From Swiss-Prot, chain A:
Gene designation per UniProt: UL48
Biological source species: Human cytomegalovirus (strain AD169) (HHV-5)
Name of this chain's protein: Large tegument protein deneddylase
Location in or out of the cell: Virion tegument; Host cytoplasm; Host nucleus
Lineage of the organism: Viruses, Duplodnaviria, Heunggongvirae, Peploviricota, Herviviricetes
Assembly description: Interacts with host CUL1 and CUL4A; these interactions inhibit the E3 ligase activity of cullins. Interacts with inner tegument protein. Interacts with capsid vertex specific component CVC2. Interacts with the major capsid protein/MCP.
Function, as annotated: Large tegument protein that plays multiple roles in the viral cycle. During viral entry, remains associated with the capsid while most of the tegument is detached and participates in the capsid transport toward the host nucleus. Plays a role in the routing of the capsid at the nuclear pore complex and subsequent uncoating. Within the host nucleus, acts as a deneddylase and promotes the degradation of nuclear CRLs (cullin-RING ubiquitin ligases) and thereby stabilizes nuclear CRL substrates, while cytoplasmic CRLs remain unaffected.
Family: Belongs to the herpesviridae large tegument protein family.
UniProtKB/Swiss-Prot annotation, chain B:
Subunit structure of this chain's protein: Interacts (via C-terminus) with the large tegument protein/LTP (via N-terminus).
Family assignment from sequence similarity: Belongs to the herpesviridae inner tegument protein family.
Location(s) in or outside the cell: Virion tegument; Host cytoplasm; Host nucleus; Host Golgi apparatus, Host trans-Golgi network
UniProt function note: Plays an essential role in cytoplasmic secondary envelopment during viral egress. Interacts with the capsid via the large tegument protein/LTP and participates in its transport to the host trans-Golgi network (TGN) where secondary envelopment occurs. Modulates tegumentation and capsid accumulation at the viral assembly complex.
Gene name per UniProt: UL47
Shown residues within the full chain: 26 to 518 of 983
Protein name (record): Inner tegument protein
Length: 49, 453, 203, 186, 48
């Protein structure tokens, strides 16, 4: 099929998947402040287990 | 002993806790000779019930029946006054318990023409209360009657029919608004209202577009903020729908020119937008507001020109006009919110003062009705109620001191708790000079006034 | 006599808690002063004390001394007086409103008390501008969990957001940021693209 | 107040350089709230005295340490003036404004090139449309944010009334503002 | 042969343990809006 870029707006689906507040707070625990949020890995761990 | 029994008068006791052996010990340990000990030798059961409470148990019938059985045992264990005797006290209390059972039976039966059934059953309940009326002094019967009246009035205010709303002069907007108010104040059993709404919206498709704005300008208009919900679940075709999505629909035109040609002035209270714009004093000077001016004047004149059946009659007369307690309170809030100084015509100012009178009077009437009972406790709480009302509704405004008379006059007219000096004389026809003083003291402690000497 | 006046005291406590008296600070002051005089008269008929645990409105107790009642009276006086002082200071500091009388009194007709909200608004109000540095937690005369500094000024009265929209957008932080934007389910002007191209070429 | 589509269009059309790291003005707002909350630190500790001198039973005592550099994000947003700031201010307060990009300096600064970027006045239709599209409803915030605070509730109602009254009737200055801003970083 | 100062130190240790646990729970409820009240928080049994 085909999609018109102008008509279709762009969301930030991360805000529902891993950029939401609760998962970020759950994954904030890390050795140092330089570590990025671990919700990306947290969803991986949940899906695997 | 006198101080203890006076504190007992001031306080209250539990029906379950008191037993026949407890009453026997209380009588026996009490000194034999005294100007109150004779009465407790004569009318211990009535005197004990004068201060007892059952409201804590939340089940009046069973706890009061247990108290009645314990008192029956004490009366088996046990000529001054035929009108008031311990055996007569037990008989009257058993009659009252029969009334308290049949009120619940009526509520269950009626809640599952319905109007004649409601009228006849409430008349039976009124007759039952009249049978139980004379011994209003007792705190136990006081709370029993209080809870009974609370339940019956709360059920009756909701079980209103919809026959009186329809008029030949009612327009499409007026009819949908009437049934909308019916939905938002009565949905317990009347489930066919949504079906009738869905049937009717297809009839008035052409007429529904006459009283709406464009999209872009309707939202900024005053008063659409409060009527957005009624408009949304008018347009969607289902009164059960919720406007959680924040959609923008064809906003209703609240202008007087559109309203007069598309509405009727008598049924305005169902429409919130006109109330909001009238209180806000944002009305254009050219606007012709004689319609609601005359309607407000005639309604206030009829209400001010004015039994439990009569109370109920006025109840469904007032709410038939769409006056709901929550709606009246919420649309009396902005009367205080709106500024006192603004530019408006003298007729607009006069009708605003009239509507302030109306909102205050009906709000006070409705909240007193929610706590209404022909008992001393009603006036006892009404004293604090009027103090709080003076604190909040009247405020420090000087112009609001004129509008005070109608509120108190109407509330004391419709919710008067009657007590007769002849009633007390009959209650104390056989009571000697020794015993009358403490019945008087208990009555003064309960009611809070020096009614007679 | 004492029990009836105690019930009146608890009713006044509930009315202040439910905001049944509105902005009429003078009425509340007169009522609490009359109640204090009545309790003093009760003590004289029956010595006042400034020590003792506060009476419990949820569980009335006949073992409460008159000193506890006097302490509760002075606590109510302090509450209403500090509130009126905060209104006076905010009226002086803000020129948007004209007079206190023009400010209305809201009714408890719109009542909704979630413990989660009741705790979250207070915890977010903690680090706002308050007169004293440190902080503590107590149980108020009304019987609920009120939080105050060592001065005793209520946090909801000593700390404010300064804007309705600030508070609304601060307590809306639940899960995903925007909900109505998702609910609505919904690219540059060509002139801006042209001016960008022209400015880049010129530079 | 403004619709989210128009806000997205303005955000994409004039992306601030320091704000280009994000995708919306709103995201900036929640991140600023997050950093403000992160500045606040709460620590709970015990107290020897169980009651105050007044006598209220004290359960625990809480202290707020605010101990600790690169400039803060909220700061750099504060002292940096952007076309976003003036555009949003003009649209919110119902006043026009003229935004233009400074190309360069010519004739030893005697003449300055100001390219026609956009103009706001009562004439062009877009300004009128965006001014009338403002939804001055804020009582829904009061309904959605009831926290047993009636005193603050009345204060917020009065403040909303005053601000809406001011916004409906803006002060006019003969429609002659002008702003000069850079294009590389807005 | 344990001294009274040892018992005072033990009392301080228990007090700090309970206060530290309570303040950590308070911080966890503060940082996480998932739980609204300590009452809803379950208590496990030491049977396992």
């Amino acid at each position: 099929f085909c999609i018109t870029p102008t008509q279709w707006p762009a969301m930030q689906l991360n805000k529902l998947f891993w950029e939401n507040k609760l998962v970020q707070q759950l994954c904030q625990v890390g050795p140092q402040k330089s570590t990025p949020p671990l919700g990306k890995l947290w969803l991986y761990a949940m899906a695997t287990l | 002993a006198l101080n203890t029994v006076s504190q007992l008068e001031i306080g209250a006791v539990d029906a379950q806790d008191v037993t026949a052996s407890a009453v026997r010990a209380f009588v026996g340990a009490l000194p034999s000779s005294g100007y109150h000990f004779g009465f407790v030798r004569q009318n211990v059961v009535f005197y004990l019930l004068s201060h007892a409470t059952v409201q804590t148990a939340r089940d009046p019938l069973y706890a009061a029946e247990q108290l009645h059985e314990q008192l029956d045992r004490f009366l088996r264990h046990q000529d001054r006054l035929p009108f008031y005797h311990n055996g007569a006290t037990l008989t009257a209390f058993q009659k009252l318990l029969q009334t308290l059972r049949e009120i619940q039976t009526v509520i269950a039966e009626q809640s599952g023409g319905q109007q004649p059934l409601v009228r006849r059953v409430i008349t039976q309940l009124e007759t039952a209360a009249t049978e139980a009326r004379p011994y209003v002094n007792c705190r136990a019967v006081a709370e029993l009657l209080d809870l009974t009246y609370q339940r019956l009035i709360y059920w009756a205010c909701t079980l209103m029919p919809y026959v009186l709303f329809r008029r030949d002069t009612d327009t499409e907007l007026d009819t949908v608004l009437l049934m909308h108010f019916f939905y938002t104040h009565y949905r317990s059993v009347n489930g066919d209202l949504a079906v009738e709404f869905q049937n009717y919206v297809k009839n008035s498709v052409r007429h529904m577009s006459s009283f709406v704005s464009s999209d872009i300008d309707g939202d900024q208009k005053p008063g659409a903020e409060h009527m957005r919900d009624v408009s949304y679940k008018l347009f969607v075709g289902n009164l059960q729908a919720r406007d959680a999505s924040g959609l923008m629909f064809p906003i209703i035109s609240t202008r007087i020119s559109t309203v007069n040609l598309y509405l009727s002035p008598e049924r305005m209270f169902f429409h919130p937008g006109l109330i909001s714009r009238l209180l806000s004093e944002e009305v254009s000077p050219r606007a012709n507001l004689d319609a609601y001016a005359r309607v407000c004047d005639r309604v206030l004149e009829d209400h001010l020109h004015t039994r439990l059946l009569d109370l109920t009659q006025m109840v469904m007369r007032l709410v038939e006009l769409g006056f709901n307690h929550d709606t009246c309170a919420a649309y009396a809030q902005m009367a205080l919110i709106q500024p006192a100084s603004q530019k408006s015509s003298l007729f607009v100012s006069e009708i605003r003062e009239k509507l302030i009178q109306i909102i205050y009077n009906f709000y006070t009437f409705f909240m007193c009705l929610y706590v209404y009972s022909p008992t001393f406790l009603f006036d006892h709480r009404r004293r604090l109620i009027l103090e709080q009302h003076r604190s909040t509704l009247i405020g420090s405004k000087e112009e609001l001191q004129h509008v005070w008379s109608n509120v108190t006059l109407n509330v004391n007219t419709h919710f008067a708790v009657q007590y007769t000096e002849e009633d007390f004389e009959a209650h104390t026809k056989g009571a000697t000079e020794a015993e009358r003083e403490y019945l008087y003291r208990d009555l003064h402690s309960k009611w809070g006034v020096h009614l007679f000497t | 006599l004492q029990e009836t006046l105690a019930t009146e005291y608890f009713a006044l406590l509930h009315g202040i808690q439910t905001f049944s008296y509105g902005l009429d600070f003078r009425s509340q002051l007169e009522k609490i002063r009359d109640l204090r005089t009545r309790f003093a008269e009760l003590a004289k008929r029956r010595r006042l004390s400034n020590e003792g645990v506060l009476p419990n409105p949820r569980k009335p107790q006949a073992t409460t001394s008159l000193g506890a009642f006097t302490r509760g009276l002075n606590a109510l006086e302090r509450h209403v007086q500090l509130g009126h002082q905060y209104l006076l200071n905010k009226l002086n500091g803000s020129s948007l409103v004209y007079r206190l009388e023009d400010i209305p009194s809201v009714l408890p007709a719109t009542h909704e008390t979630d413990p989660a909200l009741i705790m979250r608004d207070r915890l977010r109000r903690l680090c706002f501008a308050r007169h004293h540095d440190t902080f503590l937690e107590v149980v108020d005369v009304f019987g609920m969990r009120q939080i105050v500094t060592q001065a005793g000024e209520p946090i909801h009265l000593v700390t404010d957001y300064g804007n309705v929209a600030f508070k609304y957008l601060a307590l809306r932080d639940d899960g995903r940021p925007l909900a109505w934007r998702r609910r609505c389910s919904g690219v540059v002007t060509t002139r801006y693209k042209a001016i960008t191209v022209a400015v880049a070429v010129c530079q | 107040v403004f619709p989210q589509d128009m806000l997205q269009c303005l955000w994409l059309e004039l992306k601030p350089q320091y704000a280009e790291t994000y995708a919306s003005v709103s995201e900036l707002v929640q991140t600023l709230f997050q950093i403000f909350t992160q500045q606040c630190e709460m620590v709970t500790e015990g107290y020897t005295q169980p009651q105050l001198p007044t006598g209220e039973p004290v359960l625990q005592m809480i202290r707020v340490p605010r101990q600790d550099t690169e400039p803060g994000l909220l700061d750099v947003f504060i002292q940096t003036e952007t076309a976003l700031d003036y555009a949003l201010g003009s649209w919110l307060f119902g006043i026009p404004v003229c935004l233009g990009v400074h190309v360069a300096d010519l004739l030893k600064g005697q003449r300055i090139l100001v390219a026609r970027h956009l103009e706001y006045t009562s004439r062009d239709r877009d300004f009128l449309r965006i001014q009338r599209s403002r939804d001055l409803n804020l009582s829904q915030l009061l309904q959605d944010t009831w926290t047993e605070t009636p005193l603050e509730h009345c204060w917020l109602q009065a403040q909303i009334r005053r601000l809406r009254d001011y916004l409906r009737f803006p002060t006019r200055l003969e429609f002659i503002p002008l702003v000069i801003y850079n294009a590389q970083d807005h």
